Amino acid sequence: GETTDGVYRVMTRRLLGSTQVGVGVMQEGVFHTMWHVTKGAALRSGEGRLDPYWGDVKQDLVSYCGPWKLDAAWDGLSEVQLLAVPPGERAKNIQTLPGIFKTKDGDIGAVALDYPAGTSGSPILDKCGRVIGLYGNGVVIKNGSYVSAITQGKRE
Amino acid sequence: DMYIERAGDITWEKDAEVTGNSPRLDVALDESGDFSLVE
Ligand SMILES: O=C(Nc1ccc2c(c1)CNC2)c1cc(Cl)ccc1-n1cncn1
């Protein structure tokens, strides 16, 4: 169906009413979201159908119709924008300077903004508008708040 | 069955609400893609 570039809500009619389970990016005919949003299941776009193409539980990412296309990376010092698409609420840009998740395999950027679980898949942007990662996978700090990693795939 | 609805364009917006901190956290990632705090 609709393949126009942009940010999309991932909805389900399985639970009560229509519930937003997450968000995704449409770019170059490929839909990009987090694995925990869809669990790898097929998606619907009006009458059309989107089938999974690539996915990985550890990275927590999945692409639909083609290989992962997003390859921009955070520069390590600049402010980014979370284009948060919350349930029942209008899409909204929130500017922030990300922190750092230090791991045994290297350092990943991290946005410290708290949003409902249905906001998972919302894209993180650089000053050029390029998608540098997706919001939705991270940790719960001592405060009770959520700090998400800047999760980026690999472009083949 | 899950479906998608357009939510808008992907553009950087000048004069956006600047909030959030930049913490440095020690974390581990498991085989199930779940992050955890290491202390
Ligand atoms: O649930 C969330 N994220 C998540 C869920 C399931 C899985 C993963 C990440 C990766 N492996 C499977 C979440 C997402 C957002 Cl945007 C804000 C809070 C959140 N949480 C609250 N408690 C716990 N996560």
UniProtKB/Swiss-Prot annotation, chain B:
Topology of the protein relative to the lipid bilayer: Multi-pass membrane protein
Membrane side Cytoplasmic: residue ranges: 1-39
Signal peptide: none
Positions of the UniProt region annotated as Disordered: 8-30
Highest taxon of source: Viruses
Region called Interacts with and activates NS3 protease, residue ranges: 4-39
Cellular localisation: Host endoplasmic reticulum membrane
Free-text comment on this protein's domains from its UniProt entry: The central disordered region transitions to ordered by binding to NS3.
Subunit structure: Forms a heterodimer with serine protease NS3. May form homooligomers. Interacts with human SPCS1. Interacts with non-structural protein 2A.
Function: Required cofactor for the serine protease function of NS3.
Name by which UniProt lists this protein: Serine protease subunit NS2B
The organism of origin for this protein: Zika virus
Lineage, opening ranks: Viruses, Riboviria, Orthornavirae, Kitrinoviricota, Flasuviricetes
Full-length numbering of the shown residues: 1418 to 1456 of 3419
